């Protein structure tokens, strides 16, 4: 049986890059502040980056700290590097050219961050845009066949088809639509040959008023089905905490719970502590 | 050989109305891998198909 | 500030085409049915046809009855009838795809129509759960004898989804930061395409007057207060979160109300209750 | 005319700046107003850069 959490990943020594994607309101701006702040206590010798190309700077709103597009170092840690940007602002309706150009710069830019500084990113973490993931792009030279780009492109994709160096973290919720989208993810994210064996749940109520105790059922429901069909992946299982949650005190204290599958029974004073 | 993409095709749309007939939503785990299977199924054949284009 | 629900429309007398979108897990199959159900109470000299192109069918699930590719009557009423389709079933520019998909609905739609002898008056469009096909209507533009046969018919779609009185856009959405963030989104997107949209429903909503709803509750209402100074010119229906899934047309009708009548907790406490079992 | 254009970019250029300093989660109504405003101004600008283009 697959362990159900993210230690595996949270302690690699392979992977340069992690996506990480979900549509919905789906806690995953947490789950990507989460992961990235795991991975930098358990390497500290590592340097970590975690970008955002969500225009509203919510890797800011998260931290409830103001980043921006020249990566900086989280108050509270020495490892961890926040980056807020925008390709398309510092950016032929063929399918793919918009986001390789897009993606693209990015990297371009990343590098700058890595040149004109002096120490240099270990592992960057994505965190895929609420407009989607701009991954489409991976297939951009199949449909090709100007060269300069299909030229760019290979040199990346050969790299996030490496199940060593990259994969992607799927985030999503005990729910009809939000898992029915999840599947149609990971189709997509394969017809890519990229690697995904990981997905993070949110928002389990684990209730043992009224409203909670009848959420659950549906929640429990779809629960069970999720069992059945990714025995292959880890699927870590994570609680909701009532309210919002941000902070890197309170992140970092949420974010065990990739690590060490979250037990109710158990961990559950831990849960109190973040709802106050 | 076009005796085989036969048998599939009878397969594709046998088990896609099996599939439309069953609470997607009540039988989460079962729609799925069947949507899968059917997903299977729709590219063996034009492998098969593209064959017989010759 | 305009009528914070639906009545508008429900009682329109001239509305054809009906949209209903919103993406992520919106309660917004119960909101399409709703809305249908509550129109064919409010015009039954008329008849109402609520399509869904979902592989999943959800019209059956929400209704607990089993629907299919030839448009039939909701057992219970006698002017709703639902449909449940898959175009997919039946030159990679953007248009080509969606245009010819929705097209093709529109002909199999008026299939059941002559073959029938009995035709529907207004339609209502769930749209899939992977978002609307919409895009075809501004196809024209950024657009060989076969070519035309399209691009006139697409002109002639247009021409009638183009028509504030004729079709309309309705937005389902939930009190949060992401939902609303992409629910402007799409207004934007409706109405980059001349199509008419000034009605948005907010799912989900708690009201409460444990402990975490009463915490979950604060942020709904935060976002409440944003919307209210955000879409002035709209009808934007407020509604209850009843506790649990809500299927089966007596139900779906005693909830639809509140599309209406716009919901009141104080007031109409009692009723949500009564669905709550 | 040009001079007409350059006095709108700024506006442009300096309401993008400011949005991009504000919470738009603490903040919604504003921060979308203002993105609505920005979109606005791109639109007039290319009206504007076309006329140019002659
Ligand atoms: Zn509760």
Known sequence: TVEPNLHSLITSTTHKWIFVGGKGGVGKTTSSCSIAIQMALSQPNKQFLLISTDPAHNLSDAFGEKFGKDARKVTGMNNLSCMEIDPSAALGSIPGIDEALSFMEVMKHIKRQEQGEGETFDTVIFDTAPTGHTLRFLQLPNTLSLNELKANVETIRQQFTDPDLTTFVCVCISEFLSLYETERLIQELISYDMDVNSIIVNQLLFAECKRCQARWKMQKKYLDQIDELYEDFHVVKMPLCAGEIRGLNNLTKFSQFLNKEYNPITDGKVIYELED | ?54
């Open chain 2, 1 to 54: 050989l076009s005796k085989k993409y036969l048998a599939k095709v009878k397969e594709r749309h046998e088990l896609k109305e099996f599939n439309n007939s069953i609470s997607a939503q009540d039988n989460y785990a079962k729609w799925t891998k069947n949507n899968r299977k059917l997903d299977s199924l729709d590219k063996e054949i034009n492998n098969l198909k593209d064959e017989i284009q010759s």
